[PDB]
Amino acid sequence: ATGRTTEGRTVTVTTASNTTITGAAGTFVASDVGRTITRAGIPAGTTITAVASGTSATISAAATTSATSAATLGSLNGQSQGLVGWSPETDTEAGAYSVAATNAGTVTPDRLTNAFTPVSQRGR
Amino acid sequence: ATGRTTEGRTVTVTTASNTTITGAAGTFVASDVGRTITRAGIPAGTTITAVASGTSATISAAATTSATSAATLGSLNGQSQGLVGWSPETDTEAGAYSVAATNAGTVTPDRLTNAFTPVSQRGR
Amino acid sequence: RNQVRFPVLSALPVAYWVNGDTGLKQTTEINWTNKYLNIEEIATIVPVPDNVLADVDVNVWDEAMPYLIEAFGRTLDSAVVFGTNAPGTFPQAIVPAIAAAGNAVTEGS
Amino acid sequence: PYNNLTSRTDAQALIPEEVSKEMLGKATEQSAVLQQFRRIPVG
Amino acid sequence: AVIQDNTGAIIYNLAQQDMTALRLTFRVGWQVANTLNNDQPTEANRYPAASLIF
Amino acid sequence: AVIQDNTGAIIYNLAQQDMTALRLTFRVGWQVANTLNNDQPTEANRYPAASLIF
């Protein structure tokens, strides 16, 4: 029910006084690269340059302080994601359909295994 | 999806060398009282006389040995429940509708708790 | 029925400048979701000692009815606009939602 | 025994699901430049 | 009929006490249709209404 | 067809996987046609439009 989106969001993040940011489990997501990040102790105009896991990410300039605090992540224009709004697939579920994932034998959403469970549909 | 039934079932159970039986989580449930029980180390015609938890119960006669084994629980004629077949409600959630439970504020198994979730059908 | 469903769209496609006259093309997809409308009740019960109904000045049921109907009306409105006592099955009340979207103006002029 | 009940959940699926199209669909803006500038064809 | 408090004590036996009572009921719900538009794609920042406050 | 990433890995085999796809294209360009006029012969200082900015 969480989905992918172009939207901004707010997060509690921990800084080391270097390139690198950490937070609670799943606070980052794979498409966050290129968003702006605006927090206390962070120099202006800084962006996410890479995400290593939902726990930690890298930024375009060194953080000036080491602390834990709330921070804000910008929206983006829907050029980098192939999309403009919100969609029910998570940023990991959207990867399930490729030839590589299929020859590797992973499961999509649905492809429903159990014989008796009836079908159901998502909401926001 | 498990519900209630009158038809019998098979279970794995541990005997103390007295009237006490124990087993894994969900091995016993409140409606089982008055069923027959047929296992090695158990004398003929023995029945469930009380049930104390999802893991423990009392029987009409002493077990002759202490061991763990598979055992059979008998079917029953549907006098001690109104139902003869199967129902989607389990024994605990079937209790929710009384005036006392309503005063205690216990949610029914189908009280739609969030504004954006669908209603959905159960299956076996 | 206890609930009813509305479908709605939730993303739109985009388009790209081609690099040169020969560069690689890029994908898009389009997607939908749904809202729900959930039903709830209102109810009351009024007791009276039935000897009063014989001794009393005039027919009290006939006198009371408009005020019962008004109460059913008002107890709806306050729960939707101001959010008084609203059941959790409803979407957020109007005044809080307007404040959350930033659509409030402060009369300073 | 006492405490029989044909509850809503026990009675489920003898009743249908309900759906309405009332708020689907969305209008569009027309493009500016194609509407405003002088058109010319080219080969 | 009878009437009970929340604890389950009988407050009135409506028949034995020579009383009478009237019962009323109603059913409703509402929804808002704030769909996506191009004008403001940030859904947290759309609302189809505004207010004057003090 | 097949759909590729920029590295040349195949993402979808449109034929084998029972899929369908739609391609759309369009070709355009634009020009101003600012022209010699007596009131401002210095071409760098002509433009047939103006703006309000802040």
- The answer to whether the Cβ–Cβ distance between A86 and C35 falls below 8 Å is no
Nearest chain A residue to F2 by CA: give it.
A99
Q: Do the Cβ atoms of B30 and B4 come closer than 8 Å?
A: no
Q: Do the Cβ atoms of D17 and C5 come closer than 8 Å?
A: yes
Q: What's the DSSP call for residue B93?
A: G
The SS3 of residue B105 is coil
Instruction: Give CA–CA dist D20/E53, Å, rounded.
Output: 36
Cα-based distances in Å from A96 to A92, B113, B123: 7, 31, 28
Residues of D in contact with C4 (CB under 8 A): 18-20
Helix, strand, coil percent values for chain A (each to nearest 5): 10, 30, 65
Q: Is E33 exposed, middle or buried (0-12, 13-18, 19+ CB in 10 A)?
A: exposed
Instruction: Give CA–CA dist A76/C11, Å, rounded.
Output: 14
Chain D contact probe: residue of B2, B4, B31, B87 with most D CBs at under 10 A? B87
B105 touches C at CB < 8 Å: no
Q: Is C77 exposed, middle or buried (0-12, 13-18, 19+ CB in 10 A)?
A: exposed
Chain C: give the shortest CA distance to residue A124, in Å. Answer: 7
Q: What's the DSSP call for residue B99?
A: H
> To 5 degrees, how large is the angle CA C25–CA C29–CA C34?
170
Instruction: Give CA–CA dist E5/E11, Å, rounded.
Output: 6
| Exposure b/e, C45-69, CB count within 10 A at least 16 = b | eeeeeeeeeeeeeeeeeeeeeeeee
Q: Which residues contact D14 (CB under 8 A, 6 or more apart)?
A: none
C-alpha closest to that of C29 among A47, A93, A75: A93
Q: Do the Cβ atoms of B119 and C38 come closer than 8 Å?
A: no
Chains E and F, touching by 3 or more CB pairs within 8 angstroms: no
- For the four alpha carbons of B111, B113, B115 and B117, in that order, the dihedral sign comes to negative
D29 touches C at CB < 8 Å: no
Q: Which residues contact A114 (CB under 8 A, 6 or more apart)?
A: none
Q: What's the DSSP call for residue D11?
A: T
Instruction: Give CA–CA dist B112/C4, Å, rounded.
Output: 13
The SS3 of residue A9 is strand
Q: What's the DSSP call for residue B31?
A: G
- Angle between helices C94-101 and C60-81 in degrees, nearest 10: 10
Amino acid at B35: R
State the number of CA atoms in the 13 A half-sphere of A12 facing the CB.
4
* Strand stretches in chain C, DSSP E: 3-9, 32-38, 40-49, 104-105
Between positions 20 and 39 of C, the ones with CB within 8 A of D are 35
Residues of A in contact with E42 (CB under 8 A): 7-8, 75
- The answer to whether the Cβ–Cβ distance between F6 and C24 falls below 8 Å is yes
Instruction: Give CA–CA dist C81/F49, Å, rounded.
Output: 48
Instruction: Give CA–CA dist B59/B72, Å, rounded.
Output: 14
- For the four alpha carbons of A115, A120, B1 and B6, in that order, the dihedral sign comes to negative
Beta-bridged to residue E44, according to DSSP, are none
Amino acid at C23: G
Q: Do the Cβ atoms of B28 and B54 come closer than 8 Å?
A: yes
Residue C96 dihedral angles phi and psi, to the nearest 5°:
-55, -40
Instruction: Give CA–CA dist D22/C9, Å, rounded.
Output: 13
State the number of CA atoms in the 13 A half-sphere of E2 facing the CB.
7
> To 5 degrees, how large is the angle CA C91–CA C97–CA C103?
155
Residues of C in contact with B115 (CB under 8 A): 36, 38, 88-91
Partner chains of E (3+ C-beta pairs under 8 Å):
A, B, C, D
Instruction: Give CA–CA dist C2/C70, Å, rounded.
Output: 25
Q: Which residue in the block uniquely carries the two structure tokens 């107890």?
A: C75
- Supply D15's token pair: 């009743």
Instruction: Give CA–CA dist A80/A86, Å, rounded.
Output: 14
Residue E47 neighbours by CB distance under 10 Å: 19
Partner chains of C (3+ C-beta pairs under 8 Å):
A, B, D, E, F
Q: Which residue in the block uniquely carries the two structure tokens 């990040």?
A: A37
Q: Which residue in the block uniquely carries the two structure tokens 């189908």?
A: B110
Beta-bridged to residue B21, according to DSSP, are B15, B57
Q: Do the Cβ atoms of A39 and A13 come closer than 8 Å?
A: yes
- The answer to whether the Cβ–Cβ distance between A84 and C29 falls below 8 Å is no
Q: Do the Cβ atoms of D23 and E33 come closer than 8 Å?
A: yes
- Supply E31's token pair: 């929804």
Q: Do the Cβ atoms of B116 and D15 come closer than 8 Å?
A: no
Residue A6 dihedral angles phi and psi, to the nearest 5°:
-75, -15
C-alpha closest to that of F4 among C74, A100, E48, C65: A100
Residue pairs between chains C and F whose CB atoms are closer than 8 Å: 5
Amino acid at A124: R
Instruction: Give CA–CA dist B41/B34, Å, rounded.
Output: 20
Residues of B in contact with A121 (CB under 8 A): 118
What technique solved it? cryo-EM
C-alpha closest to that of B81 among B90, B70, B72: B90
Chains B and C, touching by 3 or more CB pairs within 8 angstroms: yes
- The answer to whether the Cβ–Cβ distance between C24 and F23 falls below 8 Å is no
Residues of E in contact with A123 (CB under 8 A): none
- Supply C76's token pair: 């709806």
Q: What's the DSSP call for residue B95?
A: G
- The answer to whether the Cβ–Cβ distance between C7 and D19 falls below 8 Å is yes
- Supply E23's token pair: 């019962």
Chain D contact probe: residue of E35, E36, E46 with most D CBs at under 10 A? E35
Strands C3-9 and E2-4: unpaired
Tally of residues, chain D: 43
Instruction: Give CA–CA dist F30/D33, Å, rounded.
Output: 9
Nearest chain E residue to B115 by CA: give it.
E31
Instruction: Give CA–CA dist D20/D22, Å, rounded.
Output: 6
User: If residue A49 lies in a helix (H) or strand (E), which one and from where to where?
Assistant: strand A48-53
Residue B3 neighbours by CB distance under 10 Å: 18
Nearest chain C residue to F4 by CA: give it.
C24
Instruction: Give CA–CA dist C79/A70, Å, rounded.
Output: 33
Residue A97 neighbours by CB distance under 10 Å: 16
Between positions 37 and 66 of B, the ones with CB within 8 A of E are none
- DSSP assignment string, F1-54: -EEE-TTS-EEEETTTTT-------------------TT---GGG--S------
- The answer to whether the Cβ–Cβ distance between F23 and C25 falls below 8 Å is yes
Amino acid at C105: V
Resolution of the PDB structure in angstroms: 4.0
- Supply A86's token pair: 């919100």
The SS3 of residue A21 is strand
Instruction: Give CA–CA dist F39/F42, Å, rounded.
Output: 9
C54 touches D at CB < 8 Å: no
Strands B9-15 and E19-28: unpaired
Chain D: give the shortest CA distance to residue E33, in Å. Answer: 7
Please give the radius of gyration of chain D, using alpha carbons only, rounded to the nearest integer.
29
